[model samples]
Structure formats: structure tokens, C-alpha cells
Target: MKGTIVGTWIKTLRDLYGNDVVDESLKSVGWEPDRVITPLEDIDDDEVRRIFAKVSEKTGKNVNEIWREVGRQNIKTFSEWFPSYFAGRRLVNFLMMMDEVHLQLTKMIKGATPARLIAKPVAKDAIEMEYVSKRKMYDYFLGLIEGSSKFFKEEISVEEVERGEKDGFSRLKVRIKFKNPVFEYKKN
Candidate 1:
């Protein structure tokens, strides 16, 4: 994982779990309490897992709970750092652009296997999305969607259409219905 996302997770961990827990988790992973994560740096996926495991142990919360919570909070941090991505966009618009955004963000890094975030409008008030990733972070992905709704003041209901592993990759398909119609019927 890139440090940009991992760094956000570290900050979100501290913000949600407190400095003491994050410090302890970092120390357990042989990292300094005030470790600096450069944006372009790459972090080992397993190392990140171990750090979060320590946090879960210290906080008495399961790892999925921690990741989900961090996913929600990471939106706020991302908005703060990258306001352009969030500016002047509704939840639906932002959601639709995420696939391209991920590609553009990771294009500079050689051999970066970013998650495939494919979304398409399914109806006037709903969209279907598929999350395909080798790391299987569906909880975090759902949390981010929930967070985006909150950030945009949009209410949404997310239905799990399907989820399973195939050929060493995990995939989650969801249908997200919004409170109001984001598209309208047009006569061509």
C-alpha cells in the first residue's frame, strides 16, 4: 500500500483510538511513536495488518471494526488534504469518479495494483458498484461509501448484491440507492 493511504490510516487510527493506543501499536511493530510516513513510500501490507492487530489488541475492538471506523474517518482527513477531489461534487458524482481517480493517483508508481472501483448508474436514484481487490478490504470500502454519503449530506442504503473470492481476488458488488434521484428520465 502507498504511504498516502497508510499515512491516512495511521492518522485516522490516532484520531479515533487516541495517541496512547496508536503509540503502543506502533511500538509493537518496532516503529517510532512519531514515525514519519512519506507520501510516495510503499508500506508492506502485512506490516500494516500487524500494526492494526496490535491496535485491536490494545483497544479491545476487532480488526474489522477498527478498519471500518478508520475508513469513515479517513474521508475527513482526505478532504482536508485533497479538497479538490471533494469540492463541488455530490456523493454520486464523487463516487462515479473514484475509479479514474485511483488510476490517476497510482499511475506514476510502477506495478501498482490499485483496487478496481467500477461503478455505473443503475436507475434514476441508484448505482451499482463492484470492488475488486486482492487485499479484501470490503469493510473499509463500505465504510468509505458511508462516509461519503455523510460528507455530502446524502442519505443512502447500500445492499450487498454479491461477494466472493475468485482466482485469488476478492470481489464485492453493491447496489447503493440514494435518498433523492440523482438522474432523470430524458426523451431523446
Candidate 2:
């Protein structure tokens, strides 16, 4: 699934059931609901599907709806966790800064191999950031961004660039873009 879709699902879950419900869901799965997900070296598609299915059952929400909601609400999470990425900065600046955040965060963890696979300033008011990890901990990463966005009141769009395994490494790339130009530019 794409980050946008997953991000939207997180938001919808929050809206439908509240943050605590969704937060608990992540916790039940051994995640902090605000933890970063590193790419997994080995994970099957069925496992990902099963995880979402479990979320649906736990939240009493439809699978598709959950996916869509996650997509829609991803930006909200970013705002909360990485406010410096957006605060008093343009989208391009924020995204470029994320490269640093990625590196910094990666340095802090043991066996954490999160990488910024791609980041492009694609529009006058939008930037695309892609990340790859060796772990399939998507929900934790998604939850952190969702929670961050909610905390910061920032809006963004996330899209899945690709997901696959190659040479024993599970690769997932997500393109994230800030929505409003105001966030990316100074008003003065």
C-alpha cells in the first residue's frame, strides 16, 4: 500500500474511533503508535494484508475505508513529529531538511536502516520525499507521522512509489507532499 493510503487510514481511524483507540491498536502490535518503521529485509504481502485486516476487525471499520483514511491523514502525523520540518519553512526546505532528520534518526537506532531513497521539489508548493527501510513496520511509521501531523495541524499527501523485495531486502518507497502552499512559503 502507498503511504498516502495508509496515512489516510490513520486519520480516519482517529476521526472515527479517536486517537486512543488507534494508539492502542498500534500498541497491541508492539508499536508505540509514534514509532518509526524501518524497512524489513523479509516480509510477505499476506502478512501486510493480515495486519490491516486485524486493524479493521479491531476498529470495526472497513478495510478499504481504513486504507483510504490513512492516505488522507498522513500529513497530520508529520506535523506532529517533525514540526521543525514545516515550521517557518517552505515545503522544499522542509523536505530537504527531512533528509537530515532521516540521517539523524537512523544514526540513533541500532540495526535501523532507514534511507531517503528519493526527494524532489516537484512543484512550486510541493515536494516529494521517498524513504526505504529494511523492515515492514509501516504502521508504526505511519502512526508517528499521523500523530505528528495532528499535533502540528499540517496537511500533506502521501503516495506509494513502490514496494518489493530484492536481494533479501524489503523495499518500500513513499512519496510525501505538502498540500498548502502557505506552509511552503513566507507571507511577507
Candidate 3:
């Protein structure tokens, strides 16, 4: 588990049950009532599961219900940390595109699921897009890129920068090259 996930769970508990309830719950789990999780540190998932189970037990809620509520609240929390990704574009657009890719890729492989877009802007007019899937879907993702280039009327080159699979996550890195050196929504 990531600190983000734990912190989100803490905030969700406080919101749902109240500060006093959250404080007691933290004590029950032997955790600081107001702990600050530092960056780049990993929390054990079992510990999180235990904490949620305790919350469910005390609050008379199902574990799945608690998990679903936490997930919903976490989206709000994540938007604060990564506002740039969601500021100008509605999240639905990004998710729809991913779903489209997932469906298209699934046609090729029966059990492929698109994970997320870990894209980063490397230059003024170029970006690097990373698609993670359960099974290999690099070629399918590349096809989407080609379609994107046509839609945007921009030429690009796609290069595989990295490939790795571990812990049920497979990452495909693609370096996108653009012919244009600058981006302007409209030229005067």
C-alpha cells in the first residue's frame, strides 16, 4: 500500500465516523492518531486490510463497503495531488479513451485489461506515454497512438524506451516524437 492510500483511508474514516471515532480506531490499531507519512515509503497491505476490518467491525459496516467508500474518497484526495492531469480535461475523457483501448486490446487477447496512463511531458511539443496492461498490449497501444496522430494532424515517432513486468504489472514505455517544435492552439 502507498502512503496516499493509507492517508486517504484515515481521512475517510474521520469523515465517516467523526474525529473521536477515528482517534479511537487509530489507538485500537496501535497507530498514531495523526501520523505523517513521508514520501517514497511503502505500507504493508495486510496492515491496511486489518485497519479497515477493524473500522468495519466497530462501525457495523461490511469490509467491501468500507473499501468502496475509501476508494471514492481517495479519488478526491488524488485530484488534489495531481491537479495538472485533471484541471483542463474532464476525467471522463481520459477514462473513456482508456476503456476504448482496453476493449480494442481485449479483442486481441481474451484477458487483457488496460491499467493506467503514466504519461509525462518530456518537451514543449512531445510527450512520453506509458500504457500498463495485464498482458502485453504494446502493439495495440501503438495503433491508438497512430490514430491519435491522425486525429491531431501531427506526425510522430513511437519508440519503446522500456519494458518490464513484475508483481502482476506490465509497463510499456513509449517515447513520442513530434515534428512540430512548438504547440499553439491556433495561429493568428
Candidate 4:
């Protein structure tokens, strides 16, 4: 994980949940809520996990729901930060390109731990994606998949086939389907 990712989550949390709750949540972990986070800085994933867990405990919101919302919101923030990736591309193209984007961005960053991503077409109007990470961010991944469908207005169905840890990383496989061909949804 990188400080930028965690920082964005904090900022977005303030947008959705307000500053007071965000401040108190950070306080529970002995972290200063107002501390600055540089974009290139490294952060422990477990620390982030703990912060979200604490927030969930305090707010009575399911942890997965929190992560899902964050991922859904992340699409906009991602496009803002990486406009080149978004320019002249449809939502399906954007979604499909993410694996390649993740790799290219990884080559450019020093401390960002983006999950290992790979996609394979598995069924009619669908692609199967593999999410590999140390901590299973199942909701985050699924939410992104779901959000892309809604954002693009190209209907989709995401069915989780399996999730398990393999070789020190969590692996999640999902079958994402569309009633109509996603390739034809070319509107930007």
C-alpha cells in the first residue's frame, strides 16, 4: 500500500462520513487524523486494514460495505489522477485496461503495492479476472467491477467463483458477464 491510497481513502471518508468521525477513527489507532500524507510514501496495508476495521466497529457499518463504497468512489479519483488512462476510452475499455495500467504504474512507483491483476475472457460477453494480493480485498475488487458496469451503463453480472490464499497471496477469481456485448458500449 502507499500513503496516497490511504490518504485518498481518508479524504473520501471525510467526503462521505464527515471529518469528526474520520478524526475519531484515526484517534482510536493513535494516529493523528490531521497528519499529511505524501503521494509517494509507503504505508503498511495492515495499518490501513486496522483503521478501516476501527471505523467499521465505531460506525456499525459493515467493513466490506465500507470498502465497496471506497472502491466505487475510487474510479473517479483514479480518473482524476490518471487522465491519460481515461482519455478517449469507454468504461469497458477502461476496466479491461486496468490490469495493464496496474502493471505500468507499478513500474513507475517505488512504494505502491497494487494487487496483481490479470484478465481472461471466460464466457459469452464476459471476462474472468484474477485478483492477487496479500490481504484479500474482495469487496474492493468486486465493487470496482460492479461500479464499472454501472458507470458505463453496460449491464454486467459478477459471480465469484473462488477465493483462497495461494503462495502467500490471496487469489480471487470472478466471472463477469454482460447481457449485451461490452465492446460496443463506446461512449466515453
Candidate 5:
């Protein structure tokens, strides 16, 4: 994980919970509330895990559920901070390009561990996406997909087609269907 993600998490926590709650969580983890998080700096994933666990204990919510909500909101938060990624594109294009985006963002900083997202065309109004990662942030992944729909103002149904873990790598296959068929269009 990068400091960018952690910084966003802190900000998002303040947004969702409150300043005091977020501040306390940081203090509990021996982190200062005003800690500087440089964009390209990589942070320990376990540090984030511990923060979330502490937040869960304080908030009385399941950590996985908390991550899911954060994942959903991250699309909007990230878009606000990094709108270039969205590029005001259609939902289909956005989803299709995410794998590459993941690759690009992860590569921007050394030791940044980002999940791999692979999407393929399946139908006029659907795509099959495979999520591969060692982190097993499946709930968060699903939430991000759902959040993209809201961010794009598009409606979609995400069906978990398959999921498995082997050799510590987890894979989740999903079928994402949109109400409207997406295709290339041009005025003749």
C-alpha cells in the first residue's frame, strides 16, 4: 500500500466517522493525526490492517464491512483527487481500463501492492472480470465496482461467478451487467 491510500483512508475516516474518532484511531496506533503521507511513499499494509481493526473495535462494525464501504466511497474520493483517471469516459470504458490503471498506479511507486483486475468482453451489455490478488480484498473490490456505477451514473449488476484461493493467491470472477448495451458508435 502507498501512503496515498493511507492518507485517503484517514481523510475518508474523518468524513465518515469524525475528526475525533480518526484522531483517536491514529493515536491508538501510535500515529499522529497530522502525519505527512507523500504520494509515492509505500506504507506497510499491516499498519493499515491494524488501524482498521482498531477502528472496528471502536465503531463496533466488522472490519470487512468497513473496508467494503471504504472501497465503495474510494471511487468518488479518488475521482475527486485524481479525476484524470476518470477522463469523463463512459462506464464500460472505465471498467475495461481499470486493470491497466491498477498496473500504472502500482508501478508509479516501488513496493506498491495493488490488486490485478482483468476484464473481458462477454456480451453486448456485460463483461467478465477476474480479480487476482494476494491481499484478498474481495469485498473491497466488489465495492469499488459498485461505486464506479454510481460515479459513472450507470446501473450495473455484479454477480460473483466464482471465487477461490490457491497457494495464497485469491481469485474472484464476476459478471458485470449493465442495463444499456455498450458499443462503439459514430455519426456517419
Candidate 6:
């Protein structure tokens, strides 16, 4: 995984759980309490898991809950860093463009395979999305969608239609229904 992703998680953990838990978790992973994680640096995925596990132990929260919360809150930080992505876009459009955004941002890095989010419109007010990643962060993905809905002030219902591992990748298929119509015919 990229250090930027791990670093953002650390920052989010600090925001959600406080500095003490993050620092202690970092220490448990044999990392400096104030370690700096530079962007473009490669981080071991397992190490990231261990650090989160430590934070879970310290905070008395399950690991999945921690990740979900981080994902929910991390969107604000992401918007701060990349406002262009969020400007003038509805929740469904933002979610649809994520796969391209992920690919475009990481295409220059060698050996970096970020998560794949392929979303398609299922109806005028619904979408079906498939999340594929090696890290199996389904909870985080769902939380991000929830966060996006909240950010856009759009009510949505997300149902997990399927989940499993295939060809060494974790796959989660979800159907998301919106409260209002997301598409309409326009005279051109």
C-alpha cells in the first residue's frame, strides 16, 4: 500500500480516537510515535493491519468499526486535499468517477494497484457498484459511500448484493438506491 493512504489513516485515527491511541499503536508496531510517512513511499499492508489492530485493542473497538469510521471521516480530509474532485458533483457522479481518479492518480507509480470501483447506473435513481481490492476493505468502502451521501445531502440505501474472493482479489457488489431521481431526459 502507499504511504499516503496509511498516513491518512493515521491522521483519521488521531481525529477519531485521539493522539494517545495512535501514538501507542504506532509504538506497538515498533515505529516512532511521531513517525512521518511520506507520500509515494511503499508501506507493507500487513504492517498497516497490525497497527490498526493495536489501535482496536487500545480503543476497545473492533477493527472493522475503526476502518469504517476512518473511511466515513476521511472524505473531509480528501476534499481538503483535492477540492476539484468534489466541486459541483452529485454523490452518484462522484462515486462513478472514483475508479478513474484512483487509476489516474496512481498510474505513474510502479507496481501500485489501488482499489477498483466500477459503478454503473441501474435505474434512474439507483446504481450497482463493484469494489475490487486486494486488501479486502469492504467496510471502509461502504463507509465512504455513506460519507459521500451525507456530504451531498443525498439519502441513499446501499445493499450488499454479493461478497467473496475471486482470483486473489476481494470483490464486493453493492446496489445503491437514491431517494431522488439521479437521471432525466434532456432536450439537446
The TM-scores of all predictions, comma-separated, are 0.95, 0.47, 0.50, 0.85, 0.92, 0.93
Global CA lDDT computed for model 5: 0.86
Q: lDDT values of the candidates?
A: 0.89, 0.57, 0.62, 0.78, 0.86, 0.88
Q: Model 3 segments beyond 4 Å from truth?
A: 96-188
Error of 5 at 102 (Å): 1.2
**Whose lDDT is higher: candidate 3's or candidate 6's?**
6
| Model 3: lowest-lDDT 10 consecutive positions | 90-99
lDDT of each residue in 62-128, candidate 6, tens digit only: 9999889988988888888879999999888899999999898777667766789999887888989
lDDT score of residue 51 within candidate 1:
95
lDDT tens readout by residue for model 3, 36-126: 7654445655666677677777889876666545544555555677664345553223433444543543344333343666665577566
Task: Write out the backbone clash pairs for model 3.
Answer: none
Which one wins on TM-score? Answer: 1
Q: Rank by lDDT, highest first.
A: 1, 6, 5, 4, 3, 2
Q: Which residue pairs in candidate 4 have backbone atoms (N, alpha carbon, C) closer than 3 angstroms, thus clashing?
A: none
lDDT score, candidate 2, position 15: 77
Q: Looking at model 4, how many pairs of residues clash?
A: 0
Select the stronger candidate by TM-score from 2 and 4. 4
Alpha carbon RMSD to native, model 2 = 8.6
Candidate 5, position 36, lDDT = 85
Superposed model 5: Cα runs more than 4 Å off: 111-114, 183-188
Candidate 6, pairs of clashing residues: none
Best by lDDT: 1
lDDT of 4 by residue, 73-145 (tens): 8777766786777788776567677788777756656655568778866554788888998678889888777
Cα lDDT of model 5 by residue, 33-133, tens digit: 88889877787778788888888888898988988888889899989888888886988899899999879778877555568899987887899999998
Worst 10 residues of 6 by lDDT: 105-114
Candidate 3: C-alpha lDDT: 0.62
